[PDB]
Structures are given as C-alpha cells and as structure tokens.
Amino acid sequence: FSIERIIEAEQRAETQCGDRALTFLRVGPYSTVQPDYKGAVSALCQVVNKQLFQMVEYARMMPHFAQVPLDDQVILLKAAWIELLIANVAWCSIVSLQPQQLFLNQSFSYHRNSAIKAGVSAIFDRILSELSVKMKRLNLDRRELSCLKAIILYNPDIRGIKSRAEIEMCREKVYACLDEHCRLEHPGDDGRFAQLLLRLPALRSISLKCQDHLFLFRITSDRPLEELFLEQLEAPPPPG
Amino acid sequence: FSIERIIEAEQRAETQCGDRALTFLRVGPYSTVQPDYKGAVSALCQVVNKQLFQMVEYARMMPHFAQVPLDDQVILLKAAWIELLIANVAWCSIVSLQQLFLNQSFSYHRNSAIKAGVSAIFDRILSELSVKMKRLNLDRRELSCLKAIILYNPDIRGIKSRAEIEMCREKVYACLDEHCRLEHPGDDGRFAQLLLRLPALRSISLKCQDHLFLFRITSDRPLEELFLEQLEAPPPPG
Amino acid sequence: FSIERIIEAEQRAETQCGDRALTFLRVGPYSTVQPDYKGAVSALCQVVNKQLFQMVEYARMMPHFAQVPLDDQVILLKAAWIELLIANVAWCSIVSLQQLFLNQSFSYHRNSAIKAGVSAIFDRILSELSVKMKRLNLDRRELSCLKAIILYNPDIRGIKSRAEIEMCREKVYACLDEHCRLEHPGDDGRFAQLLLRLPALRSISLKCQDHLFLFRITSDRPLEELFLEQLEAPPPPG
Ligand SMILES: CCCCCCCCCCCCCCCC(=O)OC[C@H](COP(=O)(O)O)OC(=O)CCCCCCCCCCCCCCC
Ligand SMILES: CCCCCCCCCCCCCCCC(=O)OC[C@H](COP(=O)(O)O)OC(=O)CCCCCCCCCCCCCCC
Ligand SMILES: CCCCCCCCCCCCCCCC(=O)OC[C@H](COP(=O)(O)O)OC(=O)CCCCCCCCCCCCCCC
C-alpha cells in the first residue's frame, strides 16, 4: 500500500486494456444532438467508454478494492467515475496552459470554439481555471495526482456501502502517503497538504455538472451503469 | 480470520462443553408455569442453559473477541444471545420441512406452542427463517457468517471498541461475499438477500425476549454477571 | 503497541530533551499580570514550556503518531496538551497527601494560588484528581494509559485520520483493561472508574485555559505553529 503501488495500477490499466471499452455513452435516436454532429459526439463517447473500461481494471488492481464485497465495489465506481475522468483531463490539460485547449488524452483535444459551439464552454472553462491552472500553479506532480484520485475512489460516505471502516482506512493510508510525499519533497510549505486537498471540492462540483449535461443530452445507455460495472468486475481481466 | 476458523469455533464449542450449563433459565416457585408442565418447561430451560454456556465458549474462540475489554465482551453477548440461539433453531427446523427443532433431536410440535400462547413466534420462526433459508439453499458456511455478523455488533450502547468490532464484522462480510462469488457464480443478488434475514431474526428475537420476562422463568441474577463470571473463568477441555 | 511501549515514550521524552523548551507561555507586554509578580510567574512559564517541548517528543514517539498527517498531529497536540500537563501534576501532587507539584521538586502552596487568584483550580486538581487517584491506588502504568487515551482523540474538528486514531485509542483500552484486571483484582468495576477521571480532567483543563487567556501570558504566535515547527524539525539526541 504505497504511492508506487497505486501508480502501477494506473499505468498498467492505461496500457494493457487495448481497445476494450465499457459502452455507457453513445448517441441514439433520442439524443439532443444535431445530426451533423453525431460523428463527433460519438467519437467523444468512444474515448470515454475506453477510459471507463480502464478505470474498472484500475480499481481492480488497487489495494484491498477486490476484497470488499462486490456490491460495495460497484457503488464506489458509480460514485467516483466522473471525478476520476475529469481529474485526468485536468492533468493532461496542463501541457498547453484564459486557456483554449482541453485534453482528454495526449492526442485528442478540444479548442474553446468547439465547446462554445456545443454550448458547454462554462464547464470547459472551470475545468481549466479551477483545476488545471491551480494544479500547475501548485506544481502538482504525478505522485500527488495519484494520491488525490485514490482518496476519491476510497469513499466511505456513500449510501448503501457495507465496508465503511475498511474503505476509510485505505483512504487514511493514502493521506499518510500524500503527507509523506509532501514532507519529503516539499518540506518548505507545511500548508501544501491542505491546499492539495482543496482541489477535491472543486472537482466534485464540476463533476456533478458534467453528469447533469450527460442526462440533458441523453447519450447514456438504457442499461444502468451499475450493471455494466458489475459485469466487468465479475469477468476476468484482459490480457494484462 | 476465515469461514473455517469461525466454523471451528462453533463446532468445538458444541462438543467440548459436555453437559456444562449457564443457569439463566429456571422454573421456580414464583414462575408463572402450569405445574402440570413445570417439568416440561424446566427441560426446555436446561437445553437453553447448555446452549448459552456453549455460546460463551464459542465467542471466546472467535477472532479477536477475547481482546476487547471485558465489559465489551459482556455487552456483545447480552445483545446477541437470543438471535444466535434462534438462528440455530431456524437452521435445524429446516429438516422438518409444524415441528421446530432446538437440537438435532429435541423438537416441539405446533400444538405445543398454541398451548403456551407462543404460537406467533413458532409460526414466524419457520415462516420467515427456516422456509426462506431452505428456499435460498443456505449452507453452513453462510449461517456461520450470518451468526458472526450478529456477534460483532458495534452499535450497542456502552461499547468501547466500536472500530475493532466493526472491523471484525466487515471481514466477515468479505468472507461471506467471497463464498458467494465462488459457490454461487450466478446470482449477484445472493449476498444482499442473505443479509435480509437478519432484520427478521432481530424482530422475532425481540418477541422471544418479551415472552421471557413474562413467564418469570429467568434468574434473579442479571445475565451480565453470569457471562462475566464464565468469561473470567477458564475453558472446559482446552 | 503495549504499555511498555507507551511508558518508554514518556520516560525517554522526560530525560533526553535537557533544558529545551517550546515558548508558548511568556509574560508579554500585553499581559494583565502585575509587574511585581513577574519573576515568579516567568519561572512557572519556563517549567511549562519545557514540559511542552517534552510532550511533543513524547507524541512523536507514540505508536502511529508520526505517520498520520502533520496537520492531524498538530490538532491532536493542541487539543490534548493542557490535559496531559495537568494529569502529570495530579500524579506528582499525590506525594503531598497542602502542595501542588509540577515536578518532583517544583511546587506551590495554596497561598501562592490564593494571591494569584487561582485557588479554585488549585483545590479541584488535588481534590478531584490527586485524592481520587490515590484513593483508587492508581499506578504509573495506568496513568500512562489514561494519557494515551487523551492523546488519541478522534472527535476533534478538522481531523483527517479519525479511524486510525480511534483504533489507537481502542488498543489502549484493551491494554488498560488487561493491566487493571491483572494487578488490581477484586473489582470488575475498576476499569470504568478509572475512566471517570477523564471528564474531570477535561473540565479542570478548560478552566486552566481560561486563566491563561485572561492573563495574556501566552505567545503572539499561535501554538499550532510552534507544534508544527518542532514536529518538522529533527528530534534532540533521541
Ligand atoms: C472525458 C471528460 C470530457 C470533458 C469535456 C467537456 C468539454 C466539452 C467538449 C466539447 C464537445 C464538443 C463536441 C463537438 C460537437 C459540436 O460542436 O456540437 C455542436 C452542436 C451545435 O448545434 P447547434 O449550434 O445547431 O444548436 O451542438 C450539439 O449538437 C450538442 C453536442 C452535444 C454535446 C455533448 C458533449 C458532452 C457534454 C460534456 C459533459 C459530459 C462529460 C462526460 C465525461 C464524464
Ligand atoms: C431455543 C429458543 C426457543 C424458541 C421458542 C420455540 C419453542 C416454542 C415451543 C413452546 C415451548 C413448549 C413449552 C411447553 C408448554 C406446554 O406444552 O405447556 C402447556 C401450557 C399451556 O397452558 P394450558 O394447559 O392452560 O393451555 O404452558 C404452560 O405450562 C405455561 C408455561 C409457558 C411455557 C414456557 C414457554 C417458554 C417460552 C418460549 C420462549 C423461549 C425463547 C427464549 C430463548 C431464546
Ligand atoms: C503546570 C500547570 C500549573 C497549574 C498549577 C496552578 C497553580 C498556580 C500557582 C499560582 C502561581 C503563583 C505565582 C506567584 C505570583 C503571584 O502571586 O501572582 C500575583 C498576581 C496578583 O496580582 P494582584 O495581587 O496585584 O491582584 O497574580 C498575577 O500576576 C496573575 C497570576 C498569573 C499566574 C498564572 C497561573 C494561573 C494558572 C493557569 C494554569 C496554567 C497552566 C496551563 C498549562 C497546562
């Protein structure tokens, strides 16, 4: 249970899944998307569906995750998926830093004119101003982002969860890891640890608006995400 | 901490205590019992008092139970005893499937409960527990898990080591779920369904307790003391 | 994580820090203190500032204390310090059973407290803590357990690692229970009685705080900072 073990999970999940994807997003005949922009939106859907698949395998390799009861595993993923994805876009969008580019990967990105065009420039802006900019301003490193993402995953306050204690414990061990990293690498500002945590509330708020947009444009599967997560979990991992 | 380490505790407690008994149930002079049946009721008392003694030795062997302060060990037993006993009878009565078993031999017929007024309890034990357990194909490992979950209860007033107790319960959850994923690849809803029996066990168990303080067949000494005394004492064989 | 481990921390922190101090108490220019009584009060300040330094090193050595985030470490020390100091004076003063001891040799007579206007605190420390501890035959090892229970407080606002801290407190409970029923038999109610001293300690401790602020003999710098700075620095030889 170390930052290194958490890093390994992220990295391996990102390279061993190939093109496998959890198809939750997709444009159907009831989507509020103009016909001329279906190709574009569906491309965005394929990207997210692949990151979702990877996310599941990521959690599968996270310390203790596979041990909590399956029902708990499903709830944890349902509660943190959007925040985990947005944290990754915030980090990839640090390369080209009012910001004009939002990266989902290293080779797939949007300019602000397209957001404005799609009518989602407000969420485009706060992602870059409230997360990317402040992370850069803080000199956030890859190790600190991994810690923040784990803190998110290990959430014991979700309704319905069985193993709250076990989950809170994992979270606290990540706190300890994060603080040590702070102590070791940034002994000069004792306020760093707290500042890094301040990004979490902004991540949650932005993440909630994203979900609202998803429901509004109706590009989600009729099948409940819970089922999709449960099915991948009950299945073996890909060749990796 | 494994379904098998919990199984070992139950099994050993059931065979190594002999006829040793924790005397809580008793038929005395002030007891509201039909002298025409005092013998019968006192026989029921002896059975329960032996299962109570066994229960204490069971808990003594459960992972970490003997580590929390003694006051907490006493509170845990006082809160779970009836539910633990009734879980064992519900499991046994599955065999009959109007007969309720307390042992793998000692039983009681419907017509026996209608007499003492406890026909309601009799009915729901078989109705909500035995039948549904059978219907679910409940196995011994799962009953052991349900009973452990009951024992490790952190929400009781007065408890000191809540975190440890909860941590214990959660490890049993992890064991129960695994058992499911392995011996029931299918139905992902099994785990939760099994847990649904707990509320129905608690409710029935509370009724049984109200029907005890109503027959005056309990000791003048508070059960807490009896538990404390057996705990502060050594075990029977090993 | 046993009593021997907790005792070692206290003892070593008490002898390896030499004359170092964390200057939280000072007779500043804004102290409502009368000029004539400055040397005496400042002497009291130096004593407390040395015990504060030692306290930090004590915590730094306590099981798991150092791995939780600094911020939590800071909050724990800020909430516990006064109670930890007063627990030590209660124990010391036991010898005079008149006099209130801060050390095995630093002490005050009721008259001193009389003219300083703090005879109220003076009396309940000896009365509610020292006397009752003596009356209970409280031993050093046990005083260590009570002090750990105090340190490991998970209910403070702002704390991050509540679970881990609670787990630490509960392990001390088990230690205290084990010790208590082994060296002070003849009373299963001892454990609960020993814990009753905590609320008294907290109440008295809150009043002591009130006197500090009223008089204004505290540093212009927030104690949080002073704790954070000693924690972030290396320990003395130890
Ligand atoms: C992985 C995290 C992704 C976060 C990215 C958010 C920034 C938004 C990106 C801009 C999208 C441009 C699409 C191009 C189509 C276009 O120009 O579209 C242009 C058209 C304009 O048509 P009109 O001008 O005629 O009304 O708009 C549409 O038809 C609506 C497009 C649907 C918008 C879907 C976008 C999803 C909403 C984002 C929040 C959900 C996050 C899900 C991840 C958890
Ligand atoms: C192991 C848990 C036990 C769960 C209870 C299931 C057993 C129910 C069967 C009834 C018991 C037969 C007693 C004989 C009565 C009889 O024929 O005797 C018949 C008479 C009825 O009187 P009448 O002759 O006037 O109709 O009953 C009596 O003598 C009155 C005494 C009451 C009997 C005591 C019953 C105990 C209550 C059970 C609750 C125990 C739960 C607490 C432990 C967890
Ligand atoms: C280590 C904990 C110590 C707690 C023991 C309390 C006993 C206090 C003994 C009195 C000290 C006598 C000094 C002689 C000077 C004098 O007569 O003092 C005389 C003057 C009175 O002035 P006047 O006579 O002009 O009204 O008093 C003062 O100057 C104000 C008193 C300041 C002393 C503060 C101590 C109060 C206790 C607060 C608790 C702080 C501990 C917190 C850490 C846990």
Q: What is the DSSP string of chain A?
A: --HHHHHHHHHHHHHHSTT-----B---TT--S-GGGHHHHHHHHHHHHHHHHHHHHHHHTSTTGGGS-HHHHHHHHHHHHHHHHHHHHHHHTTTT----EEESSSS-EEEHHHHHHHT-HHHHHHHIIIIIIHHHHHT--HHHHHHHHHHHHS-TTSTT-S-HHHHHHHHHHHHHHHHHHHHHH-TT-TTHHHHHHHHHHHHHHHHHHHHHHHHHHT-B-SS-HHHHHHHHHTS-----
Calculate how close chain B gets to C195, using CA atoms only, in Å.
11
- β-strand C107-109 against A101-103: which pairing, if any? unpaired
Q: From the list B67, B70, B161, which residue is nearest C181 (CB)?
A: B70
Q: For residue A103, what are the β-bridge partners? A: A109
Which tokens sit at A68?
């909590």
Give dist(CA B121, CA C95) in Å, integer: 62
Q: Rounded to 5, what percent of chain B is helix, strand, coil?
A: 65, 5, 30
Give dist(CA C116, CA C44) in Å, integer: 12
Are B23 and B217 in contact by the 8 Å Cβ rule? The answer is: no
Q: For residue B101, what are the β-bridge partners? A: B107
Give dist(CA B123, CA B129) in Å, integer: 10
The greatest distance separating any two alpha carbons of chain A, rounded to the nearest whole angstrom, comes to 56
Instruction: Give the H or E element holding residue A218.
Output: none
Residue that is written with structure tokens 């290293």 in the block = A106
Which tokens sit at B85?
């006993």
Residue B25 DSSP code: B
Q: For residue C101, what are the β-bridge partners? A: C107
Give dist(CA B100, CA B131) in Å, integer: 12
Which tokens sit at B113?
């409960």
Are A135 and A94 in contact by the 8 Å Cβ rule? The answer is: yes
Give dist(CA B225, CA C173) in Å, integer: 21
Give dist(CA C142, CA C137) in Å, integer: 10
The amino acid at residue C229 is E
Backbone angles phi, psi at A119, to 5 degrees: 80, 20
For this experimental structure, what is the resolution in angstroms? 2.4
Are A123 and A213 in contact by the 8 Å Cβ rule? The answer is: yes
Contacts of A219 (CB under 8 A, 6+ apart): A25, A26, A27, A28, A31, A33, A41, A45
Determine the residue among B1, B170, B196 to mutate to test chain A binding: the one whose Cβ has the most chain A Cβ atoms within 10 Å. B170
Termini Cα distance of chain A: 20
The alpha carbon dihedral of C211, C215, C218, C219 has a sign of positive
Give dist(CA B61, CA B10) in Å, integer: 9
Experimental method: X-ray
Collapsed DSSP state (helix, strand, coil) of residue A167 = helix
Measuring CA to CA, how many Å separate B117 from each of A224, B120, B208?
Answer: 49, 8, 12
Q: For residue C124, what are the β-bridge partners? A: none
Contacts of B223 (CB under 8 A, 6+ apart): B24, B78, B81
CA B164 to chain centroid: 22
Calculate how close chain A gets to B47, using CA atoms only, in Å.
36
Angle CA(C199)–CA(C203)–CA(C106) in degrees, nearest 5?
A: 105
In this structure, the number of other CB atoms found within 10 A of the CB of residue B34 comes to 11
Q: For residue A102, what are the β-bridge partners? A: A110
Residue that is written with structure tokens 């600190």 in the block = A144
The amino acid at residue C141 is R
Give dist(CA B231, CA B229) in Å, integer: 5
The greatest distance separating any two alpha carbons of chain C, rounded to the nearest whole angstrom, comes to 56
CA B237 to chain centroid: 22
Give dist(CA C183, CA A183) in Å, integer: 43
Give dist(CA C89, CA C208) in Å, integer: 13
Check pocket membership of A225 for ligand 1, CB cut-off 6 A.
no
In this structure, the number of other CB atoms found within 10 A of the CB of residue A16 comes to 15
Closest by Cα among C133, C126, C163, C157 to C147? C133
The alpha carbon dihedral of C45, C48, C54, C55 has a sign of negative
Give dist(CA A130, CA A125) in Å, integer: 8
Measuring CA to CA, how many Å separate B91 from each of A127, B132, B139, B205?
Answer: 57, 10, 9, 15
Measuring CA to CA, how many Å separate A104 from each of A111, A123, A205?
Answer: 12, 14, 19
Contacts of B29 (CB under 8 A, 6+ apart): none
Determine the residue among B175, B177, B198 to mutate to test chain A binding: the one whose Cβ has the most chain A Cβ atoms within 10 Å. B177
Which tokens sit at C50?
């040395």
Closest by Cα among B67, B160, B76, A170 to C2? B67
Give dist(CA B88, CA B108) in Å, integer: 15
Give dist(CA B178, CA B190) in Å, integer: 11
Give dist(CA A55, CA A60) in Å, integer: 8
Backbone angles phi, psi at C7, to 5 degrees: -65, -45
Contacts of B166 (CB under 8 A, 6+ apart): A164, A165, B152, B154
Give dist(CA A188, CA A198) in Å, integer: 19
- β-strand C99-101 against C107-109: which pairing, if any? antiparallel
Which tokens sit at C234?
């290396």
Dihedral of CA atoms B15, B21, B25, B28 in degrees, nearest 10, equals 140
The alpha carbon dihedral of C83, C88, C93, C99 has a sign of negative
Check pocket membership of A105 for ligand 1, CB cut-off 6 A.
no
DSSP assignment of B159-208 equals: -S-HHHHHHHHHHHHHHHHHHHHHH-SS-TTHHHHHHHHHHHHHHHHHHH
DSSP assignment of B59-96 equals: HHHSTTGGGS-HHHHHHHHHHHHHHHHHHHHHHHTTTT
Give dist(CA B66, CA B89) in Å, integer: 26
DSSP assignment of A169-211 equals: HHHHHHHHHHHHHHHHH-TT-TTHHHHHHHHHHHHHHHHHHHH
Angle CA(B46)–CA(B48)–CA(B52) in degrees, nearest 5?
A: 115
Measuring CA to CA, how many Å separate A81 from each of A54, A94, A150, B30?
Answer: 11, 21, 12, 65
Residue B130 DSSP code: I
Contacts within 8 Å (CB) and 24+ apart, A35-40 = A37/A118
Give dist(CA C13, CA C15) in Å, integer: 6
Collapsed DSSP state (helix, strand, coil) of residue A25 = strand
Residue B100 DSSP code: E
Q: How many CB pairs under 8 A join A and B?
A: 34
Angle CA(B53)–CA(B56)–CA(B58) in degrees, nearest 5?
A: 110
Residue B35 DSSP code: T
Q: Rounded to 5, what percent of chain A is helix, strand, coil?
A: 65, 5, 30
Question: Would you call A179 and C70 a contact, using CB atoms and an 8 Å cutoff?
Answer: yes
In this structure, the number of other CB atoms found within 10 A of the CB of residue A163 comes to 26
In this structure, the number of other CB atoms found within 10 A of the CB of residue B195 comes to 17
Give dist(CA B139, CA B132) in Å, integer: 12
Touching subunits of B (3+ CB pairs, under 8 Å) are: A, C
In this structure, the number of other CB atoms found within 10 A of the CB of residue B233 comes to 9
Contacts of C81 (CB under 8 A, 6+ apart): C52, C55, C223
Domain with A122, as residue range(s), is 1-240
Are A153 and A84 in contact by the 8 Å Cβ rule? The answer is: yes
Write out residues with Cβ below 6 Å of ligand 3. Answer: C 33-34, 37, 40-41, 44, 48, 82, 85-86, 89, 100, 102, 108, 112-113, 115-116, 118, 121-122, 208, 211-212, 215
Which tokens sit at A100?
């004009």
Contacts of A129 (CB under 8 A, 6+ apart): A98, A99
Backbone angles phi, psi at B211, to 5 degrees: -85, 0
Give dist(CA B129, CA A225) in Å, integer: 33
Give dist(CA A139, CA A25) in Å, integer: 33
The amino acid at residue B211 is H
Dihedral of CA atoms C40, C43, C48, C53 in degrees, nearest 10, equals 170
In this structure, the number of other CB atoms found within 10 A of the CB of residue C29 comes to 7
Interface residues on B facing C, Cβ-Cβ cutoff 8 A: 67-71, 160-164, 167, 228, 232
Collapsed DSSP state (helix, strand, coil) of residue C100 = strand
CA A16 to chain centroid: 18
Angle between helix axes C140-151 and C3-15 (nearest 10 degrees) is: 90
Give dist(CA A85, CA A65) in Å, integer: 19
Measuring CA to CA, how many Å separate C186 from each of B221, C142, C173, C180, C189?
Answer: 19, 17, 19, 10, 9
Residue C4, domain CATH: 1.10.565.10
In this structure, the number of other CB atoms found within 10 A of the CB of residue A187 comes to 10
Give dist(CA B233, CA B213) in Å, integer: 28
Looking at the structure of chain C, the number of domains it has is 1
Residue A66 DSSP code: G
